[PDB]
Amino acid sequence: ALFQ
Amino acid sequence: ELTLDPDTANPRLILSLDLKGVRLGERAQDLPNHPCRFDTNTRVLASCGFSSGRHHWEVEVGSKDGWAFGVARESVRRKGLTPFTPEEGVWALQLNGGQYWAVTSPERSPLSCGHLSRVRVALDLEVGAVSFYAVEDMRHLYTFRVNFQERVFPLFSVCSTGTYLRIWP
């Protein structure tokens, strides 16, 4: 999710 | 119709031959450095952006976690890890943790909308809004009200294997  | 723009895409993403579909691949492709390429966040834009008028498209969505889509202002930051937030110029829905979210900030807004298969995006640059509807009954999912002040591009992100997004007209 951090890299969305 | 809209197509995904390969030179924007994070090199881990895989774009379909017809440039309508995107998923996350197994490793980073060896692609040219381009200042417009998202080098860390798993994003890709369409090749066409909009500065006026009203525009619709549809996005078929996977049932498994890991996608987000909507619109981004052209000036969205491409290099390094950046927040996925309205302040950074992204206005999106997301499927994560088995829940659908409107990506508001500082806290996301959980949507009690039921299962989604395909979503219609309605961008209105005249009034300043982007809205999302589930196509089976056109129920309203979320609207961001934004005074857009630059060109706005369709935005797609896939940060996990096993899911996908696909553009339809």
UniProtKB/Swiss-Prot annotation, chain B:
Changing N41A: Complete loss of substrate binding. Changing L81A: Complete loss of interaction with GYG1. Residues 1-169 form the B30.2/SPRY domain. Changing C159A: Complete loss of interaction with GYG1. Auto-ubiquitinates via 'Lys-63'-linked polyubiquitination. Skeletal muscle and placenta, at lower levels in heart, brain and pancreas. Isoform 1 is widely expressed with high level in testis, kidney and heart. Changing R43A: Complete loss of substrate binding. It is found in: Nucleus; Cytoplasm; Golgi apparatus. Changing Q94A: Complete loss of substrate binding. The B30.2 domain mediates interaction with GYG1. E3 ubiquitin-protein ligase that have both tumor-promoting and tumor-suppressing activities and functions in several biological processes including innate immunity, regulation of ferroptosis as well as cell proliferation and migration. Acts as an antiviral effector against multiple viruses by targeting specific viral proteins for ubiquitination and degradation including norovirus NTPase protein or SARS-CoV-2 NSP5 and NSP8 proteins. (Microbial infection) Promotes Zika virus replication by mediating envelope protein E ubiquitination. Belongs to the TRIM/RBCC family. Forms homodimers. Interacts with GNIP2. Interacts with GYG1. Interacts with RNF187 (via C-terminus). This is E3 ubiquitin-protein ligase TRIM7. It comes from Homo sapiens.
